[PDB]
């Protein structure tokens, strides 16, 4: 019944810089707070327990502080492996959900606009009953991008799925793909298929479209 929120949900901070993650509790938990790091696709690792006691084998550049209602995980100078999801966890009682929701640490960089591509369904696929239309947002930053599909100028709902890559190691950008899925019946009943992309890095929304041809 005692709730822990880690805000922000995403902290964007430059490598080499200093990272300060917050964990705030809804009721005092004294110093019964622990902190975990969760690497991409590995096991979690304990960093801090007791709000400030460094766990065995953890680099000095991680430090814990706080007691009561405000807790901070600080990383003194960020290294490459340090970009990961960080969880806070209380043990004042043993409720069903003593974990915060986690904060994701990402590499901060300069705003970069996506390059947009749209692909019509292959002929080979269209013969098997379904038409899949793919929009590609390439190498942009920040991750927050908004993508809308419009067929014959009508907005779409329910017929698309977005996927995002992890951050590039070289330029630290993201790429996104949106796939719009339609049956040959519906796909052939319409003429203009248009991908509309909105992002901090564009002055105005970008459209890429095709006619069934």
């Amino acid at each position: 019944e005692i709730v822990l929120t880690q805000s922000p949900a995403t902290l964007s901070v430059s490598p080499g810089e200093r990272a300060t993650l917050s964990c705030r509790a809804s009721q005092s938990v004294s110093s019964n707070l622990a902190w975990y790091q969760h690497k991409p696709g590995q096991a979690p690792r304990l960093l801090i327990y007791g709000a400030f006691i460094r766990a065995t084998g953890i680099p000095a550049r991680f430090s814990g502080s706080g007691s009561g209602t405000e807790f901070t995980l600080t990383i003194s100078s960020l290294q490459s492996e340090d970009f990961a999801v960080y969880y806070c966890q209380h043990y004042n009682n043993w409720p069903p959900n003593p974990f915060g929701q986690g904060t994701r640490l990402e590499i901060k960089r300069t705003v970069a606009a996506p390059s947009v591509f749209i692909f019509p369904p292959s002929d080979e696929q269209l013969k098997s009953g379904t038409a899949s239309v793919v929009c590609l947002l390439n190498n942009f930053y920040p991750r927050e991008a908004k993508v809308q599909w419009k067929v014959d100028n009508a907005l779409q709902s329910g017929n698309s799925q977005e996927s995002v890559t992890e951050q590039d190691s070289k330029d630290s950008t993201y790429s996104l793909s949106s796939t719009l899925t339609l049956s040959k019946a519906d796909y052939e009943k319409h003429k203009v298929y248009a991908c509309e992309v909105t992002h901090q890095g564009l002055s105005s929304p970008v459209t890429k479209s095709f006619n069934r041809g």
Binding site: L46, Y87, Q89, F99, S122, Q125, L136, T165
Partner: protein, 215 residues
């Protein structure tokens, strides 16, 4: 201190599973061990912990009646067991070693590597591969559609084209099948000169497909 978990599982809803966590390099009888689940794209949930000494087993109320955690001191090993899985059991599962805090709860001072448990009525099915045609720099890719289970691995020109490649995380469709794209950026010059071939792999189905992408 090492917690080593059993391998990955693909199971049908309505079925039984036992997954194990083998412990070593510390006396297994007086440390609490327990199991934590990470549902796809969610955070961490504890399921239940056990003290192998007196066999005191305690579950999270949400998991009570759904599972059995048990221990075997001779083998220093914990077990997690469902007698009937649902498709919402699809998750990663960790064993971990706990430390107590007297009257209070616990923290997790050591974690096993994870076990991915997928639960789905789908049979194994290899991907179908459709090209994304390109229509300065141009983009092109391969659509990889309706396979089960994960993973697939996509390469380009038998691994020679490595720069500018994005292979996306797959998605679960409404049909139960996974779907996923791989794209490349390429200079405009090369199309009509260079040949572009994506090579798709799906180990579970023993399928390998090579598709040529074209103007």
């Amino acid at each position: 201190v090492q917690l080593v978990q059993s391998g990955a599982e693909v199971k049908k809803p309505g079925e039984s599973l036992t997954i194990s966590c083998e412990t070593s390099r510390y006396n297994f009888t007086y440390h609490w061990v327990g199991w934590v689940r990470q549902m796809p794209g969610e955070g961490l949930e504890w399921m239940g912990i056990i003290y192998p000494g007196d066999s005191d087993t305690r579950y999270s109320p949400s998991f009570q009646g759904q599972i059995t955690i048990s221990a075997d001191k001779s083998l220093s090993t914990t077990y997690l067991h469902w007698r009937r899985l649902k498709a919402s059991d699809t998750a990663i599962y960790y064993c971990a070693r706990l430390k107590p805090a007297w009257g209070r709860g616990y923290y997790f001072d050591y974690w096993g590597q994870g076990t991915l448990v997928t639960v789905s009525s789908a049979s194994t099915k290899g991907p179908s591969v459709f090209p994304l045609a390109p229509s300065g720099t141009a983009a092109l890719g391969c659509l990889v559609k309706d396979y089960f289970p994960e993973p697939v691995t996509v390469s380009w020109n038998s691994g020679a084209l490595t720069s500018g490649v994005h292979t996306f995380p797959a998605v679960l469709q409404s049909s139960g099948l996974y779907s996923l794209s791989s794209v490349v950026t390429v200079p405009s010059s090369s199309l009509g000169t260079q040949t572009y071939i994506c090579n798709v792999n799906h180990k579970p189905s023993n399928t390998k497909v090579d598709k040529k992408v074209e103007p």
